[PDB]
């Protein structure tokens, strides 16, 4: 288990270490063979090195089996060439590993249904994984243009593009509830139709997973009306972008969410939340997303499903007994971790 840790800025260092606390606990208990190294990245790298993703790091990530990322950026670096901004470093990391799928879970922890914008009856049991295609679609599609009279943008997809992302959805599903929902716009768009036909074909290779298809428009209504019925959801770049933001509001605290990006290279696990520089060094940062990313790591990069679920379990309980401030509570960073560990051992 060779992990590259890129603590990042602001609260990165503190929340990341909390994850490490957890990984370290499991290595000891389960004899996992954990081997990790921390590398400069983000604001910290620009400052110590003049650039966000220095060669030692790049080499660091390439020689590892997983990257655990903290948070990156802040006001301190809002005014530099894009050539060397924290965000560009993130962008480069992702490209260097040719990461084509973005994984984003949305789950309502038993007893935390109160923070959801939805009624409790509906919020209860939500546990959805949105798999978004990250390299193709309209966002990158050519021809693109603007006039004084019109503007155009092309939504285009290749069989191989659809194929790869679909493959990650099926593999993701087998480790979960083995139920996949592909989202297209088949009734109206050629692209939609092509996407549907390809996922159906790929699907033949995974008899152990149920496959269903839905219109993005229908899917939007369903993520509100009965989000508890989905497992894995896969779709294009723009639709996945919309559907993950939507789903991200279900649990009611955009601070509890981890995120993973898979592809050909070393996989990246990272909390969805920001840097929150105001809080750096105070203790108090909620390590929940960092821990949940550590857990994403065990499952998706190491296939250690059993453990990932163990950890998820621990945080679920930690959240109830010693909820952090962000959840109307007082447990600071260390306090919270401690309680997670307690349900670990």
Give the residue numbers annotated as catalytic, written as ranges: 139, 185, 217, 241, 245
- When the beta carbons of 249 and 341 are compared against a second copy, the nearer one is 249
Query: CA–CA separation, 118 vs 337, rounded Å?
Result: 29
> 225, 219, 220, 222: which is closest to 122 by C-alpha?
225
Q: Which helix (H) or strand (E) holds 99?
A: strand 99-107
- In whole angstroms, the minimum distance from the beta carbon of 74 to a second copy comes to 20
4-18 per-residue burial string, b: 16 or more CB within 10 A, e: under 16: bbbbbbbbbbbbbbb
User: Taking the alpha carbons of 333, 23, 106, 266 in that order, is the dihedral positive or negative?
Assistant: positive
Distance separating alpha carbons of residues 289 and 312, to the nearest angstrom: 11
> Does 220 contact a second copy by CB under 8 A?
yes
The answer to the question of residue 166 lying near a second copy (CB under 8 A) is no
Q: Which of 1, 112, 216, 262 binds a second copy (CB under 8 A)?
A: 216
Identify the residue whose tokens are 């060779």.
2
Closest distance of CB 139 from a second copy, Å: 5
In the complex, what is the shortest distance from the CB of residue 112 to a second copy, in angstroms, rounded to a whole number? 14
Q: Which of 89, 133, 88 is nearest to 239 (CA)?
A: 133
Kindly tell me which of 148 and 208 has the beta carbon lying closer to a second copy: 148
Instruction: Pick the closer one to a second copy by CB: 21 or 196.
Output: 196
Residue 91 found at the interface with a second copy (CB under 8 A)? no
119 in contact with a second copy (CB under 8 A): yes
Mark the segment that binds a second copy (CB under 8 A) among 41-49, 60-68, 104-112, 114-122: 114-122
Give min distance, CB of 320 to a second copy, in A: 20
The closest alpha carbon to 70, from 51, 57, 55, belongs to: 57
Q: Which is nearer to a second copy, 149 or 345 (CB)?
A: 149
Least separation in angstroms between residue 252's CB and a second copy is: 9
Confirm if 246 and 294 have CB atoms less than 8 A apart.
no
Number of residues forming the site for a second copy (CB under 8 A): 47
Task: Give the HSE-up count for residue 258: Cα atoms under 13 Å, Cβ half-sphere.
Answer: 29
Nearer to a second copy, 158 or 330 (CB): 158
Calpha distance 32→17 (Å, rounded) = 18
Least distance between a second copy and beta carbon 116 (Å): 8
The C-alpha torsion from 36 through 89 and 102 to 337, rounded to 10°, is 40
Site mask, a second copy, residues 129-158, x = CB under 8 A?
---------xx-x-xxxx-xxxxxxxxxxx
DSSP output for 119-141: -HHHHTT-EEEEEEE-S-STTT-
The pattern of x and - marking residues 223 through 262 that bind a second copy according to CB under 8 A reads: -xx------------x--xx--xx-xx-------------
Region 184-203 residues binding a second copy, contact defined as CB under 8 A: 185, 188-195
Interface with a second copy by CB under 8 A: which residues? Answer: 116-119, 122, 138-139, 141, 143-146, 148-159, 185, 188-195, 216-218, 220-221, 224-225, 238, 241-242, 245-246, 248-249
């Amino acid at each position: 288990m060779k992990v590259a840790v890129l603590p990042g800025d602001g609260i990165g260092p503190e929340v990341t270490e909390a994850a490490l606390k957890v990984l370290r606990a499991l290595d000891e208990a389960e004899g996992l063979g954990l081997a990790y190294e921390v590398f400069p990245f983000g604001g910290a790298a620009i400052d110590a090195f003049g650039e966000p993703f220095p060669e030692p790091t790049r080499k660091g990530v390439e020689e590892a089996e997983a990257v655990l990322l903290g948070s990156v950026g802040g006001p301190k670096w809002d005014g530099l060439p894009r050539k060397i901004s924290p965000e560009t470093g993130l962008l480069s990391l992702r490209k260097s590993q040719d990461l084509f799928a973005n994984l984003r879970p949305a789950k309502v922890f038993p007893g935390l249904e109160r923070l959801s914008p939805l009624k409790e009856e509906i919020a209860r049991g939500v546990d959805v994984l949105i798999v978004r295609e990250l390299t193709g679609g309209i966002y990158f599609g050519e021809p693109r243009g603007m006039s004084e009279a019109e503007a155009w943008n092309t939504e285009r997809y290749s069989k191989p593009e659809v194929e790869r992302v679909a493959r990650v959805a099926f593999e993701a599903a087998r480790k979960r509830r083995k139920h996949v929902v592909s989202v297209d716009k088949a009734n109206v768009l050629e692209v939609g139709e092509f996407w549907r036909k390809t996922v159906e074909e790929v699907g033949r290779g995974y008899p152990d997973v149920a496959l269903e298809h839905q219109y993005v428009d229908a899917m939007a209504m369903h993520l509100v009306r009965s989000p508890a019925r989905f497992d894995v959801v896969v779709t294009g770049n723009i639709f996945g972008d919309i559907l993950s933001d939507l789903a991200s509001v279900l649990p009611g605290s955009l601070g509890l969410l981890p995120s993973a990006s898979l592809g050909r290279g070393t996989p990246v696990f990272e909390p969805v939340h920001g840097s929150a520089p105001d809080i750096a060094g105070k203790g108090i940062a909620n390590p929940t997303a960092a821990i949940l990313s550590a857990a994403m790591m065990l499952e998706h990069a190491f296939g250690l499903v059993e453990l990932a679920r163990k950890v998820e379990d621990a945080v679920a309980k930690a959240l109830l007994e010693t909820p952090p401030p962000d959840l109307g509570g007082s447990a600071g960073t260390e306090a919270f971790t401690a309680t997670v560990l307690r349900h670990l051992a």
